[PDB]
Structure 1
């Protein structure tokens, strides 16, 4: 997250921290995700496509820091890694950039909700907020495009939804953006998602309910003028989510 503010898991208790085991046993951070039910985390396919084996991944819930444990956290193996059959990657754009992870502990249990662990509601179909609506994004991604490290503490920020028409402009992303994607950005281009935030939540208040509106997918650079963040439009994938859960 470029700009924004540090936070803790209590302010985004559905946030899932996803890591990969190597290859000799070091564990490194991969991507964010969102807990949509006790057994199911939703994320982006591009996070897993190069290493599509479920046994390679570990999922934490209730975690506020990257490389140290948070009191009350839960650790899960991935019982099921489901990537979207119609995934494609452009140079920039990822299409159908959506993935489901079925989580199960070594004791064979799913998530127990707590103060640090809760589910996030899915939107109703084809129902998103209007352009200019402020939403929040959360993740452990880079704080500056030039950074080598990821922040050790969880971050969040606010970005405003951009209309498909505006995002379609050549000055922005041309036809790289489809109606299954949402754009969002700061009016000053001051704050944004970045590398390491992929898979995490874009959350909007809709009807007085906190709703998983988007999943962090791609962008050209980070917090660059005329280059918004691009998000998988969750309200266009409900049957896929329904069917696979």
Structure 2
């Protein structure tokens, strides 16, 4: 996360930290036994036995009191994935989670029901704090970005046709904060007025915190059938 602020797992209790031991990507707990993430995070090493998932963890290379460690019972990648990443969504069955103040599930959005453009949402992750950094932050971070309409993002100066209706763009009005390398798979959470909802999953972007290059997210409300038919 470029910019933003540090946080502990208490402020994003559904955040899942995935490792292969080295960090791979973030994820979100959508049910006691299920974590949702991005397929591009696993495409190179499809073997489920090579992954470790943590819940209730706020530190990258240090244990957080109360954290839970899991194995990946089933690694489900989207069959229509292609690489701008298309259908960049993945499901991991963990083995399940036990709710606590540091471990909670996040609600999924209603069918094709997303917040209006301009709405402020939050993103969370252990990704780089600066594009030029080599190291990832040891402490979890989060920031706020605003949703961009498809019309604006599909502009040639932005991403053109690289962005589809199954994707969502979000950025800072000043382009001063954004997701970055290491944040993929993490949650883009918005308030559907009354409830925190998993609106998107960190997927791709040209650079980080660059003018006219918003962060692109998998539009979760367009994948409910896939999620339900696999969970």
Normalised by the length of structure 1, the TM-score is: 0.94
Q: C-alpha root-mean-square deviation of aligned residues, in Å? A: 0.4
Cα distance between partner residues in 2 of 1:157 and 1:112: 27
Cα distance between partner residues in 2 of 1:94 and 1:219: 9
- C-alpha displacement of 1:111: 0.1
Secondary structure of 2:103's partner? coil
Matched, 1:51 2:45: yes
- C-alpha displacement of 1:230: 0.1
1:52-110: CA deviation from partner (whole Å, max 9, x where unpaired): 00000000000000000000000000000000000000xxx00000000000xxxxx50
Matched, 1:10 2:28: no
Cα distance between partner residues in 1 of 2:208 and 2:46: 26
| Correspondence for 1:60 | 54
Secondary structure of 1:95's partner? coil
Secondary structure of 1:46's partner? helix
Cα distance between partner residues in 1 of 2:57 and 2:148: 31
1:179-206: CA deviation from partner (whole Å, max 9, x where unpaired): 0000000000000000000000000000
Normalised by the length of structure 2, the TM-score is: 0.99
Secondary structure of 2:211's partner? coil
- Structure 1 runs (4+) greater than 3 angstroms displaced: none
- C-alpha displacement of 1:148: 0.2
Cα distance between partner residues in 2 of 1:221 and 1:4: 17
Of residues 11, 21, 30 in structure 1, which corresponds to 2:24? 30
Cα distance between partner residues in 2 of 1:97 and 1:119: 21
Secondary structure of 2:161's partner? helix
- C-alpha displacement of 1:210: 0.0
- C-alpha displacement of 1:207: 2.6
Cα distance between partner residues in 2 of 1:178 and 1:201: 19
Secondary structure of 2:221's partner? helix
